[PDB]
Amino acid sequence: TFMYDLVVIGGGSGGMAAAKEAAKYGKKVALFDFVKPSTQGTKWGLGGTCVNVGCVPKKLMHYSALIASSIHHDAQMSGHKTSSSFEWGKLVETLRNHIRMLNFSYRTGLRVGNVEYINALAKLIDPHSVEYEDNGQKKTITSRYILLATGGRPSIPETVPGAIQYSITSDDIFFLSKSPGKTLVIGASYIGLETAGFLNELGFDTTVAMRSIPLRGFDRQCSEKIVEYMKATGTKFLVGVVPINIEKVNENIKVSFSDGSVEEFETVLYATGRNPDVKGLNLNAIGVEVSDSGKIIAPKDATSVPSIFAVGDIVEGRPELTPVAVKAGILLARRLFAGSNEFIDYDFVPTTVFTPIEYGHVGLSSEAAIAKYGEDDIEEYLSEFSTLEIAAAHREKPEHLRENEMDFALPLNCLAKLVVVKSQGEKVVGFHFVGPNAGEITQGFSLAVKLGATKKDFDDMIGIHPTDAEVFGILEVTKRSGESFVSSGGCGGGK
Amino acid sequence: FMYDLVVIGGGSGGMAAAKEAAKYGKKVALFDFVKPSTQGTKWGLGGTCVNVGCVPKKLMHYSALIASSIHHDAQMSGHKTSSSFEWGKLVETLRNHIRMLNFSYRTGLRVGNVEYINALAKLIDPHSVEYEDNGQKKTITSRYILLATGGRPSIPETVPGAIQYSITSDDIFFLSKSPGKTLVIGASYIGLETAGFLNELGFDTTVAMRSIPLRGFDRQCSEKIVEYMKATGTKFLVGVVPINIEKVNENIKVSFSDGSVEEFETVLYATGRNPDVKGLNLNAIGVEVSDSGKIIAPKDATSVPSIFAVGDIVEGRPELTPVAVKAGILLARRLFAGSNEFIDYDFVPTTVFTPIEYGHVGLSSEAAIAKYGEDDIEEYLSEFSTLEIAAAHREKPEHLRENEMDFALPLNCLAKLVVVKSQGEKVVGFHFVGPNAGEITQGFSLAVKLGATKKDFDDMIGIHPTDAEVFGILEVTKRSGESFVSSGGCGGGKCG
Ligand SMILES: Cc1cc2nc3c(=O)[nH]c(=O)nc-3n(C[C@H](O)[C@H](O)[C@H](O)COP(=O)(O)OP(=O)(O)OC[C@H]3O[C@@H](n4cnc5c(N)ncnc54)[C@H](O)[C@@H]3O)c2cc1C
Ligand SMILES: Cc1cc2nc3c(=O)[nH]c(=O)nc-3n(C[C@H](O)[C@H](O)[C@H](O)COP(=O)(O)OP(=O)(O)OC[C@H]3O[C@@H](n4cnc5c(N)ncnc54)[C@H](O)[C@@H]3O)c2cc1C
């Protein structure tokens, strides 16, 4: 008795997934998506945050970093003699051209999967209605179900003066027509670390402002190695120190600090966090119960209004990740229309940080596993080592960080770790890898864990040689045994 | 019994048995010696994988991998790059790192309390062996003996001018000379891999293939590899072997089985390997050796029950490092530390490091179609390009353009699951063609082994953006007959 079966307010990963899956069932779908311009005026097309100002551009930026390293460390050692200069402006061009492809690419995929895209803001009018603008004339449509999927945007703190007026965000940094030069990043979140990662690797004086600890939430050992690697590679780290003032001194940005120090940067980037973009939705009036944290309350993807659902960055007590959006979004479209009652096993969500060395994992940090099971049912088997090709390169620290005459070597680029449970035959509850291609490595092993692997199964695993992944077949050292888990020997993670 | 265990071979299998056996206060001798290659090459401790196998090759492959990115990628990511290449320096990096490992290993044996001796061994009876010392032959006795002398290349003695001229996989990493224009005879994993880095590193590289590429492995996956290498300037003479090789001045002229002729500055026989067992003096002792020369010991135990075998010399087992090692370790456990364990040879992963790497565990589409028939078999797969390379728009060299939209190198990635209808779609085949195959294949080898089903795979949460996440969204099938090409080109996985 409603104009539609399903309306979706948000053209993001979660958004477009639910829409297309819902449409695979002859069910009639509207989708809204409009890009409110950033605090610095930046704006873009269809696909959401992952296509535009997220995972897609990110990785191309990381890739162009990973390249630049090999060039500087590896190219000659592998017998390739090289000049190379870098133009920000062209890297941008490659991003915008590929992203443009995807914006278009996606519009089409919605049309072809038979979904009515409308480029316009939506605003909840009641349990089954929404309001938008059309030619600047406000029209209203009605649905059996509605999906909120609006994503978030960056939080620039309003108590630090000269932030909003000047500082850029994640939404602007892939597409600066201007190389950002000497750059302060405020954040030791996955984004900040990643973003201060490629600026450095791409040869820009990069400082990082860490209020306390790096990557709050993730496993401590693994995060402490990442920071150690990034210091070694020319990223500087002001811990316990945030900005308290930001001002324009000529064509530079002077940045007063909490400890009582000052510094000038050509570009400043607040990576401090994100707030769900739910303010224009008009929630509370409809009756959508939202947390103290602004995030919406809907842990089975269903709000306080049961004709209304939510997914992705906006819903509380779930990771903010693209595939987590998608699975939930697909399922919700199945559960409703195609007789299903599957929900995501949240106990098993892999992720990977693409820091200059990548960190992947599934399940519990050593810390979280020590709590749930106590430091007696907990055994930490690990091996820290160099991947063969990089062992051969003899990668060195930049001069300005040398302390002695045999100080040349970067840290070993890998660390593998399984955390397992004495009282469940050493059942595996934590899988963690710091290295190149951590995600490519993390993936296969996420499913073995989720199929209930033990250390027994791991050691009966036969290696692929040479790989860094094979180290998992021969972890024997332990935290409890206290002895050396280092492996200088360039045999690798197996023989 | 002067000893508890003697080992003739310092290879992967060899050194593993030794050092595990030694972890039990048991007294261990270990022999090595490197009989010089048909072209006079020789090296130190560690075996074929350290010296003239997986170690050097991966560094050579990496230096290739690099060369591509430089030529295809660098610019698009905004790095403008001049680059010329020095064969002699790549060598130097190999030699120096391998030297590190030769030494590195000696120490690991000493420190794990094992008596390494650099000289040839020769069986004298079920419990005795003979070597040379100052050129004076000395003899020792053991409770058990382990044969694992590895293999060496097979250069065919029927084709004239082969042995005197052609090189092998034991020469190629250390050539004092850049090989230039190179014929490789064999589309085995070696030949393919080796013609892979010579090409990527810019040497006119032809491959001479008696029949089909990578005999044994899954056909679709092998056919993509060859297709990718043709696209990148490797040439391929099918159904044609050499029948004559001669030195025409300072080049090598190479007459063919079809009639044709060609000159190379290099020929390399990758046609296979034979177990290095002829000097062991086996049959006299009573070691039953197969029609294939390989030894018969499928429980690592020979016809003489005081005598064992492991690695490339034992029959009906894959020619691999890790299979050597675990078998070698276990046998040292089974004997001396009260153990009953054998390798599950149903689940041995592998990765071919071709310009696109191919990994897999379990059955080729073909092998699964046989065992279970074309009804109980479902082939779910996806062809696509990894997002980084999608952005680069890698294009073909001009001389291989046939039309105006002929620019494309093939998609670099193919994922496939083979599963069994009648066991709830239980997964019996895992196959991946792309970059960081092996890195991808390994994790997935164990999940498969633990009895992953298609449903477990589709309920898998993904990491984005990776190529490996494609395994969480394979829906197309060979049987459904539809296109398995990428809806867009957004990595390996979709952003919604
Ligand atoms: C720098 C960065 C790197 C990241 N890297 C990764 C990564 O590597 N892997 C990963 O899995 N995730 C990554 N993410 C996270 C990923 O971007 C999010 O998990 C994902 O984009 C969330 O999708 P969503 O459907 O919730 O909406 P989003 O993808 O957040 O997109 C929201 C959309 O909602 C639309 N919208 C909002 N309000 C309205 C309205 N009123 N009417 C109509 N449309 C509206 C907007 O147009 C917008 O396009 C990254 C994020 C960032 C910022
Ligand atoms: C080019 C190439 C690449 C390869 N790549 C891979 C790969 O990527 N992955 C993989 O899993 N496998 C790979 N392999 C296979 C792998 O090298 C072998 O399966 C494995 O190393 C065999 O070990 P082994 O102990 O059986 O023999 P080997 O490792 O060859 O060692 C045997 C040793 O015995 C010595 N010896 C011989 N006769 C005597 C004697 N009378 N007395 C004393 N010592 C003696 C030999 O000289 C040698 O040092 C590759 C092989 C080659 C040639």
UniProtKB/TrEMBL annotation, chain A:
InterPro entries hit by this protein: FAD/NAD-bd_sf, FAD/NAD-binding_dom, FAD/NAD-linked_Rdtase_dimer_sf, GSHR/TRXR-like, Pyr_nuc-diS_OxRdtase, Pyr_nucl-diS_OxRdtase_dimer, Pyr_OxRdtase_I_AS, Thioredoxin/glutathione_Rdtase
Keyword terms: Disulfide bond, FAD, Flavoprotein, NAD, NADP, Nucleotide-binding, Oxidoreductase, Redox-active center, Signal
Cofactor requirements of the protein: FAD
GO molecular function, one term: thioredoxin-disulfide reductase (NADPH) activity
Binding annotation for FAD 3: S13, G14, D33, F34, T49, C50, K58, A122, D313, T322, H465
Annotated residues for binding of FAD 1: S13, G14, G15, D33, K36, T49, K58, A122, D313, T322, H465
Family the entry assigns: Belongs to the class-I pyridine nucleotide-disulfide oxidoreductase family.
Name under which the protein is recorded: Thioredoxin reductase
Source organism of this protein record: Cryptosporidium parvum
Lineage: Eukaryota, Sar, Alveolata, Apicomplexa, Conoidasida
Automatic annotation (TrEMBL), chain B:
Pyridine nucleotide-disulphide oxidoreductase dimerisation domain ranges (all copies): 348-471
GO molecular function, one term: flavin adenine dinucleotide binding
Gene3D superfamilies xref list: FAD/NAD(P)-binding domain
Keyword annotations from UniProtKB, A to Z: Disulfide bond, FAD, Flavoprotein, NAD, NADP, Nucleotide-binding, Oxidoreductase, Redox-active center, Signal
Binding site for NAD(+): G186, A187, S188, Y189, I190, G191, L192, E193, G272
Disulphide bridges, residue numbers: C49-C54, C49-C54, C490-C495
Gene Ontology, cellular component aspect: cytosol; mitochondrion
Cross-referenced InterPro entries: FAD/NAD-bd_sf, FAD/NAD-binding_dom, FAD/NAD-linked_Rdtase_dimer_sf, GSHR/TRXR-like, Pyr_nuc-diS_OxRdtase, Pyr_nucl-diS_OxRdtase_dimer, Pyr_OxRdtase_I_AS, Thioredoxin/glutathione_Rdtase
Residues annotated as catalytic: H464
Binding site for FAD 3: S12, G13, D32, F33, T48, C49, K57, A121, D312, T321, H464
Residues noted as binding FAD in the record, renumbered to the chain: K58, D312
Cofactor note: Binds 1 FAD per subunit.
Cofactor(s) this protein requires: FAD
E.C. no: 1.8.1.9
Residues binding FAD 2, per UniProt: S12, G13, D32, F33, K35, T48, K57, A121, D312, T321, H464
Binding positions for FAD 1 per the UniProt entry: S12, G13, G14, D32, K35, T48, K57, A121, D312, T321, H464
FAD/NAD(P)-binding domain ranges (all copies): 3-328
GO process annotations (BP): cell redox homeostasis; cellular response to oxidative stress; glutathione metabolic process
Family: Belongs to the class-I pyridine nucleotide-disulfide oxidoreductase family.
Function: Catalyzes the transfer of electrons from NADPH to thioredoxins TRX1, TRX2 and TRX3, which in turn act as reductants of disulfide containing proteins. Able to reduce nitroglutathione (GSNO), a compound involved in the transport of nitric oxide (NO); however, TRX1 is more efficient in reducing GSNO. Has no catalytic activity towards oxidized glutathione (GSSG).
Name of protein: Thioredoxin reductase
Organism for this UniProt entry: Cryptosporidium parvum
